[PDB]
Amino acid sequence: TELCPVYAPFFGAIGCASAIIFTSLGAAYGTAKSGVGICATCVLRPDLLFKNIVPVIMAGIIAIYGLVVSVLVCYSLGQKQALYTGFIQLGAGLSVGLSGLAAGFAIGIVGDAGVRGSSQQPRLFVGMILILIFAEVLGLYGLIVALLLNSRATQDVVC
Amino acid sequence: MTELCPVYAPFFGAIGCASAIIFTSLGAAYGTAKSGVGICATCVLRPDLLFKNIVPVIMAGIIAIYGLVVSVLVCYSLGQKQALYTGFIQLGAGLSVGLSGLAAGFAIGIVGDAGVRGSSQQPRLFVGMILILIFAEVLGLYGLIVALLLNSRAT
Amino acid sequence: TELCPVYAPFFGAIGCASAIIFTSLGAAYGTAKSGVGICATCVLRPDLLFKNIVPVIMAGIIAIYGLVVSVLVCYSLGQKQALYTGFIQLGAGLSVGLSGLAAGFAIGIVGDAGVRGSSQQPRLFVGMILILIFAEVLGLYGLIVALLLNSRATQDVV
Amino acid sequence: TELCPVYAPFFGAIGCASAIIFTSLGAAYGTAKSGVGICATCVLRPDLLFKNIVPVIMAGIIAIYGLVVSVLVCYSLGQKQALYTGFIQLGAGLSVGLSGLAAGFAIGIVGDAGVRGSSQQPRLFVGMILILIFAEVLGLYGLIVALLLNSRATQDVV
Amino acid sequence: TELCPVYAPFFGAIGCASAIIFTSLGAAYGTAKSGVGICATCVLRPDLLFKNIVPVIMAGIIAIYGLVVSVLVCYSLGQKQALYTGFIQLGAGLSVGLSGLAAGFAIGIVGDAGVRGSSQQPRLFVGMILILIFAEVLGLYGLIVALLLNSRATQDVV
Amino acid sequence: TELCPVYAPFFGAIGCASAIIFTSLGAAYGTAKSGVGICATCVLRPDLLFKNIVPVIMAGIIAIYGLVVSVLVCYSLGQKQALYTGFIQLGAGLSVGLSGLAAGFAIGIVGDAGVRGSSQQPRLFVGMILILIFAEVLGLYGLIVALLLNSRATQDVV
Amino acid sequence: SNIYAPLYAPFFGFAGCAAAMVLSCLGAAIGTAKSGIGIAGIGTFKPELIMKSLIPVVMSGILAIYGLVVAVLIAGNLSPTEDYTLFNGFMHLSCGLCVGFACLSSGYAIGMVGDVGVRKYMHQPRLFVGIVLILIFSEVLGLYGMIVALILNTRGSE
Amino acid sequence: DILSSIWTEGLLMCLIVSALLLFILIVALSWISNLDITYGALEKS
Amino acid sequence: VSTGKAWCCTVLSAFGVVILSVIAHLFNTNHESFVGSINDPEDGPAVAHTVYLAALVYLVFFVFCGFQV
Amino acid sequence: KFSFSHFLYYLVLIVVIVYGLYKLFTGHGSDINFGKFLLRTSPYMWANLGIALCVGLSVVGAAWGIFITGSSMIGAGVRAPRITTKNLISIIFCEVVAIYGLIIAIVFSSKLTVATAENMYSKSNLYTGYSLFWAGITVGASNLICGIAVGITGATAAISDAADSALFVKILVIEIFGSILGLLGLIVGLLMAGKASEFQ
Amino acid sequence: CIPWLLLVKPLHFKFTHKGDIMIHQVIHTIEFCLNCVSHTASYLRLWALSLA
Amino acid sequence: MEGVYFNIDNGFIEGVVRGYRNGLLSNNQYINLTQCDTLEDLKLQLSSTDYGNFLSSVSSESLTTSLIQEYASSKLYHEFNYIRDQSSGSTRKFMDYITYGYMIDNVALMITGILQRCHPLGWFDTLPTLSVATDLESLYETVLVDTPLAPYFKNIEIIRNKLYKAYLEDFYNFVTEEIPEPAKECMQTLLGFEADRRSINIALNSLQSSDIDPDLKSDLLPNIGKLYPLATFHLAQAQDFEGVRAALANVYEYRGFLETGNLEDHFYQLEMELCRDAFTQQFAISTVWAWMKSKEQEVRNITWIAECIAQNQRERINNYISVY
Amino acid sequence: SAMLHSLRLHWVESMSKFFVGEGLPYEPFAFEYKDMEVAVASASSS
Amino acid sequence: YGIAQYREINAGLPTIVTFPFMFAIMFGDMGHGFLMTLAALSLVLNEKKINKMKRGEIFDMAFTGRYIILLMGVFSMYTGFLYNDIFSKTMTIFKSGWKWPDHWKKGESITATSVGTYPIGLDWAWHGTENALLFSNSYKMKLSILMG
Amino acid sequence: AVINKLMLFTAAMVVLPVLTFFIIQQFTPNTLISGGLAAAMANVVLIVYIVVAFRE
């Protein structure tokens, strides 16, 4: 029907793709930036390796958010799914993906700066963690929005 | 479908819901990254100023909180057969809050970096920092207000 | 057929293309960015050559994921396939391809730093391995999403 | 009608706009690049109240060309104007506008060179006005083209 | 009528405009960069306005070619002209305009370099004028092509 | 008629324009680069003008290739010309134009380097000539392609 | 109802309003900020001559005054219940473009002249009349644009 | 009365608003990519 | 065990007891602000009972942490 | 010379030119029918884009001026923290710019009403859609321009005040001119939307 | 009230002191008139923060 | 425009730099230091200025002109390293290039082998190796290849001036490419002055050596600035001081300012003019260069006054160079 | 946020109506417990 | 902001009330005002213990503003009472001035009728209504203009 | 010690959120709480890691 056109699953499939793609881009940026920071610092301060690898963990959190939303959108995909469902899946994918991309950029920059700083000043570690959490909640918010959208993707939907 | 409620009407609502959180989150990410670079540079010398210098990243975070609020509010106004009127209401709310919070987050990041640096060199600059930074936050706040006003008219 | 238009296999074919193209591009960045670091590392201390080749292998694994997805979606292609399965094969291809592109980007950068660091400090080897794993699981997640999409591609499809 | 569509005055209005836009841009560039370049000996400039005006005069003349063509096409515009008349007014506007923009760029660069390279020798300030005339006559050519074309705008038109 | 559509004079007017627009841009570059080069004659007065100004006169002659072609194509323009006339006239305008733009770029570059060199050592002048002739002949070719096109713009038109 | 449409001469006029335009820009670049080289060198050695104005001549030669193709295309333009001959005239125009643009880049760069080197080492003169011959036969290839293509423009046209 | 007054004409009317005001604001802000940069350093804190220091920002504000005048005149001819024609829509759009771009050019030239101007004549009062004359030639550009806008207002809204 | 069977007004304005959002996104990502780190205050003393 | 955590959890659990007790009372009395909407839980006292149990859980936490204050 | 952004600019320019020539030559030039695009398109897209861009560009200008002048005054405040409260009027006038956008967004939101399908695309509804769209763009873009200008001027004022307190006073006049620019933009937006009826 | 503000205070100085404060008075009164509007606008942040 | 994007990264930096510019000693403060009668009195009077309590740890008996110079230079270097630490991207590279000049100075001073680094801003990890690098053949391929001076390299005065030629040319290119318009023009003019000073000094050094071929100076004269190429070529062909005068007769600036008076005083005076002019641009990173040069001249003046009150000879106390 | 905005209303909207300002701080000559943490001052403040 | 001119009116004396109460108008919640009041009282009641004690900087800032924060909390409780807000929820301590229709079907878009006016504070009948934002915005915007 | 337990933490972060996600997805059709549990597991692993990092 017109409520469920044949191009409706395009938006859902590309939202599924975009969730994991952009969250993986954010997690990759965070991992790479904080990882060059860690590799630069741990040459002189090897024992800090356990502590200063936290921003990589936080980027991995963004990647897990993207995985979760992508899998939810995947199981919500259908051949005769509504066009509304397509837009909602696209919105959830873009929300989680781009919010996690922003969170990953923030995590990468803050993790690099804070790892290199804390290699000098141990007390800076708590500040680094607090800022990284404030950066990670951005991806958490993106996840929350994506989850709410995907929950509403098929509620009261007719074909 | 109907002339008032086209099948493509929910596209604007969903994309506005996405836009709110996305652009507010990029604004918050820029603010958090810039101010966190400032904090980490500053607190190598003077870690005692951590809980002062933490303010700009916190304000960046509240920008994303405003975005989350708007995204949730427009999300629960979405429907398959929703009107095109409410679709563009949701689009306008999401776009307003997203762009406003994006600009506010950029301003917060830059001002917070400069402020933490200065208030580490000059402690009397803390009140100045924070009072400029609240003035940057209030712009994302204004975008939130417009998004709320628009969303009040969704259906 | 409305549900199976003649242009439906276009999305499947370009999804099969992208799945390898972008994973191989990410693996290329990873292998090059890490390889220059390995070369600049072993010029001073060649004895750690086979210890420093790890990021190159981790980057190649990304292209392996892309190859896997490309093969599966390639065998999922048909002339009269639905437009739905075309969109979802495109989604799987883009998922794995761009997730592996991000993974290869991260692996290349952090391995470029890490081979140098490990040569200068052997204890940093395990740290570099850890960050490489956290970068590689990005491509692994892209693979998981692509595999789930591909399994969904031709189930309950008219 | 076919010859005189409702959207016919669009091209005339765009020609009128361009006649002002591009000539004013050229004149502004000439005036800015000239008046802001005066330095060195021109910082003192005791012998006269003004020594860098001629490039500004010629930029203003370019702007006057734009004004003249724009006013003429204003008074040539109409509601039931022919589409041909719209194209002619657009062509005249673009001619005068972009030719005057080129002339303004030339005048600005030549004046910047002349005043930046200020010297006590009279040679430059008595001879570079010839180069300035060669720059301004480009806008004069644009004006001639615009005036002729506009004179043809409503000639043998039905 | 299909052979003479109402949008046919659009291409003719755009050709007329371009013939003076692009040619004047070329002449503007040639005059401006040559003039800033001639500013090296701030020391040597007897070359300023006597021999060093050859490049700017050649740029002006380029603009003369552009004016000639623009006027010629303007007087062949008409409301009910053929679309073939529009294409031929746009082709003439673009030919002369962009060939004059190229010639003006070459004239400006070579004139700046040669005027500075001749201000350093005068014997370069005879070579400079020859190279400038080669540069200007490009615009002369553009003039020839545009004139031939305009000559056949209304030859066998119905 | 569908195979001789009204818009067919558009491609012919654009081919005629391009044939001179792109070759004139190529020649302009060649003559500009070479002229800079000559005007730099001839100051220090004012007798090698005839030995170093060779690449300028070759740039002029690719320009006359463009002129030839433009005039031959121009004499093939007609109001009721086929769309086929329009595409072939456009193809010949591009074939001579962009290949002569590449030849002009090559001639300009090679002539610049060889002029600045030949003054320092006269033995380089014949080598520079040889390289310029390659870079100019480079545009001669485009001329040959354009001539063969244009000869086929009206061969079997209905 | 009326082919000459389609319902989308107010789009172009309000576009004329925006092009007037936004671009006049661009001109006024460029002029005011750029000149203020100069004014901040010049002046030596002398109170009585501040009114001569502030001339460039006054002229820059006058540009915005022109923009406001034109936007108000356009908006006063816009109403949902009136028979607003498409011709009037294009006329108002051209009003906006003309005045906005003329004021933008005027603001650019006012700022670029006025910063160095105030830095000069505030310390060299001899150059006052010269700098002011240049600023006047800079401001008449916006005056020309406003004149064109006024003429297009009277003709379009007939 | 339709402007296009493919480029329908609904699709066209969906594209327009998505392009506006994408333009704002590209500007935001440009600014965020301009985030260099002031290493000197926090690198190697 | 530590005084800081003891005080933090004591204060949080005191607010828990008070706020969840008043919420449970308002659900138990079918107050409109908590039950008047179609989107609210349909049976006031039922959710009131579980909110009351949560208030008792925070009571346990409050009394325990007081024993470590 | 190459850049990806300019490459896409030239690519889309070429594509649009080729498409226009294809439509025009085949006699289908009227298929590119921007007027019918304006007629068919929903007035609410125009209205809500007007409001959203009004407030968004007002906030962008306010924030842009704010971080310009705030960063400058914090840097200048390192030696002279007295500069903060003295030059804070610059931050104030930057914020007032966004407040203008907020006010205009409120006024325009007063116009948003559910128009009947039978009256959806009437003269009045199209007029008010275009009016709110372009008035919001006018106010937002003027506010962006004025916020950037006021921020630049206030940064210069803060730095000059750091140099000497006597130089501050006359730059505040420049800031006043910058604020008057935004006020004029607001009043012109009000005039543009003044006679635009609600959606009916 | 605008001419009143501009004139009355400076002209008293000009006549009775036995004007130099014209510039200060004119800038002060223009900023006062504009600050009245901008302050009435800025007090909307009470509602803004309350609603947020 | 200038300031639209400038304050994203450099707004704090540029504000702090002109804050330091306000802290430069005025002519009145130089006069007050001149009227002092002892090093402790100068310490107190200078503490009354923006230097503050920097010698606060130094007693009057330990206080010497060398300590005053070292502390003033240390304060300048700490301020510069603060600004550089707070810098990123283009401005960070600009400041690194500023440091490369002191790096070249340190290279030339240390290869003389005692000569230490003697300049904190020119320090690099392998700099002290240059004290022990007697073999000039091993210089690049052993020591300098690791340093940022590697792109520049290709008796010691020849090496120093070749490094300066390459460095100044590369930094002019960097200024042209990566620096916005007002700062671009200001830095290009400042580099023109710096290359003119280098060319004039190198020509006057070649005046004392018979082996200074005109083509040899082509590896040595930067050919940048108003003297380029013409006056630079004339200096290359110049054989003696008369040749230098004839070469400089062909330019507006720096004409008649080497035929009379002290040449160093004239170069420093013109440098202060250019730095004062560069401070007028409001959103330009050239303010950093102007600040650096102004502070260096300030430290020179302070050390000069310290000498004139530690060894008396107060007739020379007023010959310091200042525009502030 | 609310307290900083009320500070805005007072410094800007309320006091600018009447506050002449630019007075002279009282800060009399009085002895105080100058703790030895002032060793940071005069040694790390310049 | 700045030190007052000699023997001009001190702004701090009006500020004592106006600053906390503008803060309250913007803040305006009884739950959050109550939390702020408790936080301030933890400093005011123990005032003698935190005095003559080292306080750092942030905790010192909290202590020096303890009466500022106390007045913020109290006026915020009053404002939230007028806003009828305790956290998200509304108080129902007086009879509403709005009475709903006698009967309605589930899901019907009913409208209340003005039986009277609510004595002090916003009427709790506005809680959860879909047009609550219109009335609340009108009220708070006009309140802002009037009180400013 | 760190070489092994940090391997445990990387394995936990890679695996446990995903396993919790799929197990909850299998047991419950409600997507919202499934994603909530997955994110909760990820953040709990993160919090435990931060706690042990502070303990050092």
UniProtKB/Swiss-Prot annotation, chains C, D, E, F:
One of its GO terms (biological process) is Golgi lumen acidification. Its main location: membrane. The record marks E136 as: Essential for proton translocation. It is found in: Vacuole membrane. Pfam families: ATP-synt_C. It comes from the Eukaryota. The chain crosses the membrane at residues 8-30, 53-73, 90-111, 124-149. Present with 8450 molecules/cell in log phase SD medium. It comes from Saccharomyces cerevisiae (strain ATCC 204508 / S288c) (Baker's yeast). Residues 1-7, 74-89, 150-158 are vacuolar. GO terms for cellular component: fungal-type vacuole membrane; Golgi membrane; membrane; proton-transporting V-type ATPase complex; vacuolar proton-transporting V-type ATPase complex; vacuolar proton-transporting V-type ATPase, V0 domain. Belongs to the V-ATPase proteolipid subunit family. This is V-type proton ATPase subunit c. The gene is VMA3. Proton-conducting pore forming subunit of the V0 complex of vacuolar(H+)-ATPase (V-ATPase), a multisubunit enzyme composed of a peripheral complex (V1) that hydrolyzes ATP and a membrane integral complex (V0) that translocates protons. V-ATPase is responsible for acidifying and maintaining the pH of intracellular compartments. Residues 31-52, 112-123 are cytoplasmic.
Curated annotation (Swiss-Prot), chain H:
The chain crosses the membrane at residues 12-32. Disruption phenotype: Reduces association of VMA6 with the V-type proton ATPase. Decreases VPH1 protein level. V-ATPase is a heteromultimeric enzyme composed of a peripheral catalytic V1 complex (components A to H) attached to an integral membrane V0 proton pore complex (components: a, c, c', c'', d, e, f and VOA1). Interacts with VMA21. Associates with the assembling V0 complex. Accessory component of the V0 complex of vacuolar(H+)-ATPase (V-ATPase), a multisubunit enzyme composed of a peripheral complex (V1) that hydrolyzes ATP and a membrane integral complex (V0) that translocates protons. V-ATPase is responsible for acidifying and maintaining the pH of intracellular compartments. Functions with VMA21 in assembly of the V0 complex. Belongs to the VOA1 family. Present with 12764 molecules/cell in log phase SD medium. This is V0 assembly protein 1. It comes from Saccharomyces cerevisiae (strain ATCC 204508 / S288c) (Baker's yeast). The chain holds residues 213 to 257 of 265 of the full protein.
Swiss-Prot record, chain I:
Keywords: Endoplasmic reticulum, Membrane, Transmembrane, Transmembrane helix, Vacuole. GO terms for molecular function: proton-transporting ATPase activity, rotational mechanism; RNA endonuclease activity. Residues 1-6 are lumenal. Residues 28-50 are cytoplasmic. Its main location: endoplasmic reticulum. It is found in: Endoplasmic reticulum membrane; Vacuole membrane. It is a multi-pass membrane protein. GO terms for cellular component: endoplasmic reticulum membrane; fungal-type vacuole membrane; Golgi membrane; proton-transporting V-type ATPase complex; vacuolar proton-transporting V-type ATPase complex; vacuolar proton-transporting V-type ATPase, V0 domain. The chain crosses the membrane at residues 7-27, 51-69. One of its GO terms (biological process) is proton transmembrane transport. V-ATPase is a heteromultimeric enzyme composed of a peripheral catalytic V1 complex (components A to H) attached to an integral membrane V0 proton pore complex (components: a, c, c', c'', d, e, f and VOA1). Accessory component of the V0 complex of vacuolar(H+)-ATPase (V-ATPase), a multisubunit enzyme composed of a peripheral complex (V1) that hydrolyzes ATP and a membrane integral complex (V0) that translocates protons. V-ATPase is responsible for acidifying and maintaining the pH of intracellular compartments. This is V-type proton ATPase subunit f. The chain holds residues 5 to 73 of 85 of the full protein.
From Swiss-Prot, chain N:
Residues 28-29, 91-138 are vacuolar. The chain crosses the membrane at residues 9-27, 30-46, 61-90. Glycosylated. It is found in: Vacuole membrane. Residues 47-60 are cytoplasmic. Subunit of the V0 complex of vacuolar(H+)-ATPase (V-ATPase), a multisubunit enzyme composed of a peripheral complex (V1) that hydrolyzes ATP and a membrane integral complex (V0) that translocates protons. V-ATPase is responsible for acidifying and maintaining the pH of intracellular compartments. Is present only in vacuolar V-ATPase complexes; enzymes containing this subunit have a 4-fold higher ratio of proton transport to ATP hydrolysis than complexes containing the Golgi/endosomal isoform and undergo reversible dissociation of V1 and V0 in response to glucose depletion. V-ATPase is a heteromultimeric enzyme composed of a peripheral catalytic V1 complex (components A to H) attached to an integral membrane V0 proton pore complex (components: a, c, c', c'', d, e, f and VOA1). Belongs to the V-ATPase 116 kDa subunit family. Present with 55714 molecules/cell in log phase SD medium. This is V-type proton ATPase subunit a, vacuolar isoform.
